[PDB]
Amino acid sequence: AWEMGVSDPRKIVFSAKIGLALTIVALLIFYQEPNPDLSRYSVWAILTVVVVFEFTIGATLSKGFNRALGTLSAGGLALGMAELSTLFGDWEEIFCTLSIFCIGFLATFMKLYPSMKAYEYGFRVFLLTYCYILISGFRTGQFIEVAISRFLLIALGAGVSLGVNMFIYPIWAGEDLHNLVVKNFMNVATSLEGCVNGYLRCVYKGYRSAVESTSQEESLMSFAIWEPPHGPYKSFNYPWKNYVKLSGALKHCAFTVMALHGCILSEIQAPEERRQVFRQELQRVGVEGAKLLRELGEKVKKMEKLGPVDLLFEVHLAAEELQHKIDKKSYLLVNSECWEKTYESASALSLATFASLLIEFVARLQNVVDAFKELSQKANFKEPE
Amino acid sequence: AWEMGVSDPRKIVFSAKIGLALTIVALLIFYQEPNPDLSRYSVWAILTVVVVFEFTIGATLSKGFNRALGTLSAGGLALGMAELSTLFGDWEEIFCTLSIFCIGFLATFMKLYPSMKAYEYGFRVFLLTYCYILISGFRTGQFIEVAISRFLLIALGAGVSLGVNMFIYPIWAGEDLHNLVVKNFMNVATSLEGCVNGYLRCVYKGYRSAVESTSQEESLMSFAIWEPPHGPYKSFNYPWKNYVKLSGALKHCAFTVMALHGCILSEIQAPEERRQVFRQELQRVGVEGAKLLRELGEKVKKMEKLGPVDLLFEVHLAAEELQHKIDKKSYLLVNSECWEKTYESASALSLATFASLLIEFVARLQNVVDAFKELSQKANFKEPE
Ligand SMILES: CCCCCCCCCCCCCCCCCC(=O)OC[C@H](COP(=O)(O)O)OC(=O)CCCCCCCCCCCCCCCCC
Ligand SMILES: CC(C)CCC[C@@H](C)[C@H]1CC[C@H]2[C@@H]3CC=C4C[C@@H](OC(=O)CCC(=O)O)CC[C@]4(C)[C@H]3CC[C@]12C
Ligand SMILES: CC(C)CCC[C@@H](C)[C@H]1CC[C@H]2[C@@H]3CC=C4C[C@@H](OC(=O)CCC(=O)O)CC[C@]4(C)[C@H]3CC[C@]12C
């Protein structure tokens, strides 16, 4: 309630816009001279403002196109089918009912298509429009006449909804993917630091969102291609795919962070004393990785280019130091007496796993800087301050 | 198309049932004596059969209840608000429009609630019903009269849709979670075998579905609690939660299989010659794990109890043999000259990671047999043949 409103004020603005549109339409309908058909068809303009408003502007311009195509096709097909059914006599009702049967069967079958999963609304609109335009009219000429009135009412409703949506505090879909990309870096860095600290002690939301939020960026990219230039994004063809590429490159490391976190919840764990021998190198590598990830995130937020100095010098050095430390004290991981209990060796061998996973992270942190450079070049960025 | 139909014939039956219901309703409406209001309100029975049909029976009995509650509450609130607005004079329209504003604002705000995410249809039905019942009627007594007719038509449509749905080849939601649980075991076993073979060579769908399909079982469990006894499930309170518990227990191992698969796609990999020294033990452990998983899956499919002999004897032995083999030849994983290049040791240390992950799998395969025993006891099973 109040906590939700204070946390995010965009929802309040959305609700206010919906209320304002509904109030405008209701006032326009009410303050009209009485008409015989002004009380029977005036409810068609208030049911169109509640079925056209969407959060983002791209989600409002991309779904309206489909919904239209569907409505127009269904209306045309229904009119043609009625005109063809008038051909025969004394048997029209049977043809109409068999047309309803075939149409419903085909609509349901095509709506159950794996690939066509997010377009259910279009098929349902098609089916409903066909049924209504045939049953309600029960005639060809009689119906076509009232189509004019019903289209004017539905277009008044859709025009008022579009006007109000695209003019009072618009919410663009291109400014959401950017914030998601920026937040992913911080989440991954926090998860890495938490995992390292938890292991060296006497971490889920970050990588969970980094991995799970893989289908929530494709939708935003699909919505953002319908919007016009607005502010910093000064172009008609903005490379919105490079953001998805960078997000996938970061998810690749997020998988390794997931594995590191899973290491903690294992049933076979090494003794604390052995863990407390590689503390400094592990903590240094963790801090350097987190710092580099946060630096990349901040650079993405401000839309700036990478400077001259390399960013992975300290991570690439801390990895070498950790490797050397593991090499020196590598007799605590594997016993040497039996060379040519099981639980003891199983618990002692987990530190090599942890070190190898950390090294894999540090060896997978370069694809995200290649992706960042590609993005910073495709979408013209500002030179570093 | 034809491939979809041959792969799954349930969709064809669903489409046929939808078509049959629509045809019955259309014939009933058409073959009726002409009435002044039989052509203006007869389209309200064909728009209710297309908005009430759902795949499963539980999904049809669980959503209808909410949709009803919402419709009834909205109608009552609208009637009360109209009766209260009649109190004043010459200013009713303003009160009605401010009621529309407040109702729309509250509806949108409560529909944007994180927790209330899957109940959007109920809120939209509430809002649409309120707006229609106020604007269309523009009166209290006049509207209440026609409510009888509109309710009879909507109940004829919903009754024909429910009859047709629950009598001609029903599709129960309790027979889908069972098949998902059975399929998960086979998928995980196949993924494990594929990963092992790929590593020992000169694997994604299984664990992906095991992990990803975590929210598709809660929905089935929620739908299955509305259905009555049918066939083998002879009880009014069936333990549908134990299936989810078993699925989560299997997902726990699926995470380790995910880590094993990720090991293959790493940038630092051990030499093939060193890999070819532990081939037999790894292959034996993989085969035993796959066989045990398939045995548990088959036992779940047939609804049978675990016999006397233990199931993890051979896995628990192959793990010991692998541990001994790693102990004997443990000088190929860590160098001994530097005791007190980096890439060489980094690549050589990955075999310990692979072995440790395999041992973790074999040490996490017991929670799934505890969960299976608990399920086999809570839901009375048949004694083994
Ligand atoms: C040449 C080209 C010609 C072009 C031809 C153009 C054709 C124009 C076609 C016009 C028709 C198109 C209509 C489409 C509009 C969308 C409609 C729609 O989809 O539905 C939304 C929606 C669609 O499904 P959704 O997207 O999942 O929400 O369905 C509904 O929600 C409507 C549900 C109907 C229930 C309304 C009940 C209100 C009255 C209840 C009274 C109960 C009183 C009880 C009292 C109790 C207390 C005593
Ligand atoms: C006539 C051609 C040359 C231009 C198009 C003019 C209108 C006839 C179009 C523009 C927007 C269309 C509307 C777009 C959105 C909707 C809401 C749509 O709602 C749903 O799809 C149900 C909700 C859901 O599925 O989530 C019902 C049809 C309708 C009113 C469409 C009817 C046809 C409209 C008014
Ligand atoms: C009156 C009390 C004592 C018993 C209930 C009798 C009827 C008035 C109930 C039973 C089923 C209800 C219907 C259940 C399902 C729907 C479809 C529903 O569709 C949607 O919610 C839109 C689609 C979607 O959101 O996915 C619109 C209202 C309606 C017809 C409901 C209106 C009220 C109905 C007819």
Author numbering:
A (entry chain B), B (entry chain A): 77 to 278, 298 to 435, 527 to 571
From the paper:
In plant cells, ALMTs are key plasma and vacuolar membrane-localized anion channels regulating plant responses to the environment. Among the different ion transporters and ion channels localized in the vacuolar membrane, the ion channels of the aluminum-activated malate transporter (ALMT) family play a key role for the transport of chloride and malate during stomata opening/closure. ALMTs are also involved in transporting various anion including chloride, nitrate, fumarate, tartrate, citrate, and malate. Here we report the cryo-EM structures of ALMT9 from Arabidopsis thaliana (AtALMT9), a malate-activated vacuolar anion channel, in plugged and unplugged lipid-bound states.
From the CHS-supplemented dataset 1 with no malate and dataset 2 with 10 mM malate, we unequivocally identified CHS densities in the lateral fenestrations and phospholipid (PL) densities in the pore (hereinafter called as “pore lipid”) in two classes. The only difference observed between the datasets 1 and 2 was the presence of a malate density in the pore of the dataset 2. In the CHS-supplemented datasets 1 and 2, we identified two distinct classes in the sterol mimic-bound state: “sterol 1” when one pore lipid tail of the sterol mimic (CHS) is in the fenestrations and “sterol 2” when two pore lipid tails of the sterol mimic (CHS) are in the fenestrations. Unexpectedly, we observed that the succinate head group of CHS interacted with several residues. Since the succinate group was the key structural moiety to differentiate CHS from native cholesterols, these interactions were likely to present artificial features and to inhibit pore lipid expulsion (described later). Similarly, the succinate head group of CHS in the lower fenestrations occupied the S3 region interacting with W120, Y208, and R226. These observations indicate that phosphate groups of PL and the dicarboxylic moieties (malate and succinate head group of CHS) compete with each other for malate binding sites S0, S1, and S3. The sterol mimic-bound and pore lipid-bound classes represent plugged states in which the pore is blocked by the head groups of one or two pore lipids. Additionally, the TMD of the sterol mimic-bound classes is similar with those of the pore lipid-bound and peripheral lipid-bound classes, suggesting that plant sterols may contribute to the regulation of the clade 2 ALMTs.
